[PDB]
Enzyme design. Structure first.
Site, PDB file in Angstrom:
ATOM      1  N   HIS A  93     -44.767  19.798 -33.075  1.00  0.00           N
ATOM      2  CA  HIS A  93     -45.915  20.564 -33.536  1.00  0.00           C
ATOM      3  C   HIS A  93     -46.500  21.329 -32.359  1.00  0.00           C
ATOM      4  CE1 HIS A  93     -49.546  21.555 -35.890  1.00  0.00           C
ATOM      5  NE2 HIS A  93     -50.190  21.346 -34.757  1.00  0.00           N
ATOM      6  N   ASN A 110     -54.689  21.490 -42.118  1.00  0.00           N
ATOM      7  CA  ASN A 110     -55.472  22.694 -42.366  1.00  0.00           C
ATOM      8  C   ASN A 110     -56.587  22.457 -43.377  1.00  0.00           C
ATOM      9  OD1 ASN A 110     -56.175  25.399 -42.057  1.00  0.00           O
ATOM     10  ND2 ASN A 110     -54.756  26.096 -43.650  1.00  0.00           N
ATOM     11  N   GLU A 272     -38.852  21.915 -41.926  1.00  0.00           N
ATOM     12  CA  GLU A 272     -40.300  21.804 -41.803  1.00  0.00           C
ATOM     13  C   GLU A 272     -40.726  20.446 -42.340  1.00  0.00           C
ATOM     14  OE1 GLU A 272     -43.011  24.271 -44.168  1.00  0.00           O
ATOM     15  OE2 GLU A 272     -43.655  25.223 -42.298  1.00  0.00           O
TER      16      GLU A 272
END
Lengths: 434, 64, 206
Positions: A93, A110, A272
Site C-alpha cells: 500500500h 476511504n 488488487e
C-alpha cells in the site's frame, strides 16, 4: 488459568468478523454493479454475517466458473498452479501520509475518514484498504518490486505486510482494479524492459478482465480462493496466448524464481487486495521508494516531511497556495509560524494556479480557518472584487452563493460591505447569519 | 458455530446477558491474541449496539 | 465574397466560459468532478487562438442570462467574431444552472441579427457540454451529450492546440468527432453533433 485464556481469542476473531461484515455489507447493498448481476444484498442498519456468507458464495461461483473454462489442465500447468498456491504474497500500500509511528502502522479506508471528517456508487468498496499484491516471497523487508498499480503512483512510501496477518482471512482480491477492470497495454505497463522481450504478449495484455455476461463483472475471490484463482486465470491466458517465448518463460524461469513470477503476474493482471475498515498492525515494513515532493505532502497532510521540503520563503509561499486550494488546515498552521510572509507575497498568482488569491479563499469547500487567519493578519483585501474569475463579485458573493453559513459569518465580522453583492445575492444573507 | 454463544459467557462480568464494554477493551489490549490498540477502537464501535458502554453478546450473535 | 470570414480586426473576439461545477440541493444534481480540468484546458487553448477569455464558475440561471445579455449589448466592432462555452448538466435543448434550468434559445436570444448589429455578418460560436434549437445566420453549435471519465473537451483542445491556426473550423470539429468516436471503442457509438449556419469558411488569422 483454565480454558478461558485460549478461548479469549474468540473476542476479536468475532469482532473482526462483525466489522468486516459491515464493509462488505456496504459493498453489496449500495453497489450498483452488484444489482445488474444480481449479486447485491439486503439493507440493514448493522449488516449481519450474511454479507460474509455471500462473499464465500460469490467466490465459489467465480472459482467454479474459471475451473469449468479450463477443466482439463496440462501436466506442466498443474505444476504452475501449485507454484502459485504455495507462494506467500506481500501486499503493498502506497500513499503520501505518515501512516505509522515506527511501532504500529494504521491505514484507514476511504470510508472511515468520513465518520471523522461515481465509483463510490458503482462498487461502494471504499470501506476497504487498497493493496498491490507482490508475489516475490523473498521476505517482507525485501525491496518492493512494483512501484505502480494500474499506472498509479499512489505515494512515496510503501507499507508492505505479508499474507500471514489475521486481517487477510476476511479480505478479497480482484484480478485488476475493481472499478477500472482493464489491465493496460505494453506501453502503459511499469516494467517495460521485461514486457519488451516478449512481443506477441504485449498485444494480448490490453484486455478487459471479467467473468459474467457483463463486461464490468470483475471477478471477486475470498482469501481461501485467491491463489487458486490467479493461477487458473493465468493458465486461461497462457492457453490462449500465441507467444512461444512467454508460454515457455512461465513454465521454466518463472517457477524457479520469485521475481520472475511477479513480473508475469503483475503484467498479465493488476491484482488488487482489499482489507475491510482498518489495517492496524505492528508487523509491517516501510520502504521509501522515491523522494516526496511539496504538493505530495500538502494533500496527504504529512507535516513532518513538509518541514524539510520547504527550504526557502518561496517554497513556503508555494506550499501555502496548495493548502488553500485543497483545503488543509493544519498544513497552513505549520507554514504560518515557521515562515513569516508578507502581504505582497501572495499578491500575484503562482504558475500552475488558475485561480487568484481572493477567489481561492472563497471557493467551494474553502476553510474558514484558512480564511479567518488570512484576514486577521490582513494579508488580503476584504472587499476587493475578483478580476479574473466571476468578475464583479466579492468574497461574500461566493459565501452566500454556495450557502456556507460559517464563511459568511467571518467575512462580515471582518467588515464586508453587505451592499457590494450583485443582484443575484441581495437579501439572502440574513437567512444564513442566524 | 453454536459454541460461539458460550465463548462470550466464559468471561461475562455478571452472569447472563450484559457484559462490560471496557472489559472487552482491556481483554483484547493484553489478554487473548495480542491485538493492536488502534484496531480496538473500531471493534467496540460496531459491537455495542446500545452505543454508550455495554456488550450485548446474546443478541449480537442472534442478529448476525 | 472571398468565401472566408474577414479576420482583419484588432481583437479576435470575446469568449465566455461557463463552468457550473456545483449545484443546489433543489436541483438534485451531483458535483461535476473534473470540469475544473476542462475549464483550464479551454482557457489556455482559446486564449492561445486570440480570444479575450473570461471564466465564470457556478452561475445561476439569472446570472447566465444577464451575463450573455450584457455581452450581446457590448460593442463588437473591433471583434472578428464571438465564442461561448458551456460546461454544465443538460437534458433536451436546456442546460443546468446552479439554481435551475434555462433553455438554449434564451442564451442565443439576444444574439440574433436584429438584436446584435455589431456581431452581424460575424460568426457566433457556441460550444455546449451537457451531460446527464434556434436556426439563425452565422451561428455554429457544438452539442455533446456524452459524459466522460471529458473526452469531447480534451479532443477539442488537443486539435486546436495543434491545428487551430491552420485548419478551418469544420476540419477541427470533424477531427474532434473522430477522436471521440475512437474513445467509444477503446473504452478508457455516441458522437457530438455540429449545427452549422455559417456562410463562409472560418480561419483564425491575427
Amino acid at each position: 488459568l483454565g480454558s478461558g485464556r485460549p478461548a479469549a481469542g474468540k473476542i476479536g476473531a468475532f469482532l473482526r468478523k462483525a466489522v468486516a461484515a459491515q464493509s462488505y455489507g456496504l459493498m453489496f447493498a449500495n453497489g450498483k454493479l452488484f444489482e445488474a448481476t444480481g449479486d447485491a444484498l439486503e439493507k440493514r442498519g448493522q449488516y449481519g454475517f450474511s454479507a460474509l456468507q455471500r462473499l464465500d458464495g460469490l467466490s465459489r461461483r467465480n472459482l467454479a466458473a474459471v475451473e469449468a473454462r479450463l477443466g482439463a489442465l496440462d501436466s506442466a500447468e498443474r505444476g504452475l498452479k501449485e507454484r502459485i498456491m504455495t507462494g506467500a504474497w506481500h501486499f503493498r500500500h502506497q500513499s503520501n501520509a505518515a501512516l505509522d509511528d515506527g511501532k504500529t502502522a494504521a491505514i484507514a479506508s476511504n470510508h472511515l475518514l468520513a465518520r471523522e471528517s461515481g465509483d463510490k456508487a458503482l462498487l461502494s468498496n471504499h470501506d476497504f484498504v487498497f493493496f498491490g499484491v507482490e508475489f516475490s516471497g523473498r521476505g517482507k523487508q525485501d525491496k518492493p518490486l512494483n512501484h505502480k498499480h494500474s499506472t498509479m503512483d499512489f505515494g512515496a512510501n510503501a507499507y508492505v505486510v505479508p499474507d500471514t496477518l489475521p486481517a487477510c482471512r476476511h479480505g478479497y482480491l480482484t484480478l485488476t482494479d475493481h472499478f477500472f477492470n482493464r489491465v493496460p497495454g505494453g506501453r502503459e505497463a511499469e516494467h517495460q524492459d521485461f514486457v519488451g522481450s516478449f512481443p506477441q504478449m504485449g498485444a494480448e495484455t490490453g484486455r478487459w478482465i471479467h467473468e459474467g455476461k457483463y463486461r464490468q463483472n470483475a471477478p471477486i475471490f475470498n482469501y481461501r480462493d485467491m491463489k487458486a484463482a490467479v493461477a487458473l486465470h493465468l493458465i486461461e491466458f497462457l492457453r490462449d496466448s500465441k507467444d512461444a517465448a512467454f508460454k515457455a518463460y512461465v513454465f521454466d524461469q518463472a517457477m524457479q524464481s520469485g521475481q520472475a513470477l511477479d513480473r508475469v503476474l503483475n503484467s498479465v493482471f493488476q491484482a488488487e487486495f482489499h482489507i475491510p475498515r482498518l489495517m492496524a498492525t505492528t508487523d509491517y515494513a516501510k520502504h521509501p521508494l522515491r523522494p516526496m515532493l511539496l504538493k505530495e505532502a500538502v494533500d496527504s497532510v504529512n507535516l513532518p516531511a513538509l518541514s524539510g521540503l520547504v527550504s526557502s520563503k518561496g517554497d513556503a509561499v508555494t506550499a501555502m497556495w496548495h493548502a488553500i486550494d485543497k483545503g488543509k488546515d493544519a498544513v497552513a498552521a505549520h507554514l504560518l509560524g515557521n515562515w513569516r510572509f508578507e502581504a505582497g507575497d501572495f499578491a500575484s498568482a503562482p504558475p500552475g494556479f488558475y485561480h487568484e488569491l481572493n477567489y481561492a479563499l472563497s471557493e467551494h469547500g474553502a476553510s474558514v480557518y484558512i480564511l479567518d487567519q488570512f484576514l486577521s493578519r490582513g494579508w488580503a483585501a476584504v472587499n476587493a472584487p475578483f478580476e479574473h474569475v466571476n468578475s464583479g463579485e466579492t468574497m461574500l458573493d461566493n459565501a452566500v452563493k454556495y450557502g456556507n453559513r460559517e464563511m459568511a459569518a467571518a467575512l462580515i465580522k471582518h467588515g464586508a460591505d453587505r451592499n457590494l453583492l450583485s443582484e443575484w445575492n441581495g437579501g439572502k444573507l440574513d437567512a444564513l447569519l442566524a | 458455530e453454536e459454541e460461539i454463544r458460550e465463548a462470550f459467557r466464559v468471561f461475562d462480568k455478571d452472569g447472563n446477558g450484559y457484559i462490560s464494554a471496557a472489559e472487552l477493551r482491556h481483554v483484547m489490549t493484553n489478554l487473548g491474541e495480542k491485538l493492536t490498540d488502534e484496531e480496538v477502537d473500531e471493534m467496540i464501535r460496531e459491537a455495542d449496539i446500545d452505543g454508550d458502554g455495554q456488550v450485548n453478546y446474546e443478541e449480537f450473535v442472534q442478529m448476525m | 465574397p472571398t468565401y472566408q470570414y474577414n479576420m482583419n480586426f484588432e481583437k479576435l473576439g470575446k469568449c465566455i466560459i461557463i463552468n457550473n461545477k456545483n449545484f443546489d440541493k433543489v436541483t438534485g444534481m451531483g458535483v461535476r468532478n473534473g470540469t475544473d480540468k476542462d475549464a483550464e484546458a479551454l482557457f489556455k487553448c482559446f486564449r492561445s487562438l486570440g480570444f479575450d477569455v473570461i471564466v465564470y464558475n457556478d452561475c445561476s440561471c439569472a446570472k447566465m442570462q444577464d451575463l450573455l445579455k450584457k455581452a450581446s449589448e457590448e460593442d463588437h466592432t473591433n471583434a472578428a467574431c464571438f465564442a461561448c462555452i458551456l460546461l454544465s448538466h443538460g437534458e433536451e435543448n436546456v442546460i443546468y444552472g446552479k439554481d435551475g434550468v434555462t433553455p438554449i434559445k434564451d442564451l442565443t436570444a439576444h444574439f440574433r441579427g436584429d438584436r446584435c448589429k455589431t456581431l452581424l455578418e460575424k460568426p457566433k460560436l457556441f460550444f455546449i457540454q451537457a451531460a446527464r434549437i434556434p436556426v439563425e445566420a452565422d451561428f455554429l453549435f457544438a452539442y455533446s451529450t456524452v459524459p466522460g471519465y471529458s473526452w469531447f473537451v480534451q479532443a477539442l483542445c488537443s486539435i486546436l492546440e495543434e491545428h487551430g491556426k491552420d485548419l478551418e473550423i469544420m476540419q477541427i470539429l470533424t477531427r474532434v468527432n473522430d477522436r471521440v468516436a475512437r474513445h467509444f471503442e477503446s473504452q478508457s457509438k455516441q458522437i457530438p453533433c455540429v449545427v452549422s449556419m455559417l456562410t463562409k469558411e472560418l480561419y483564425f488569422s491575427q
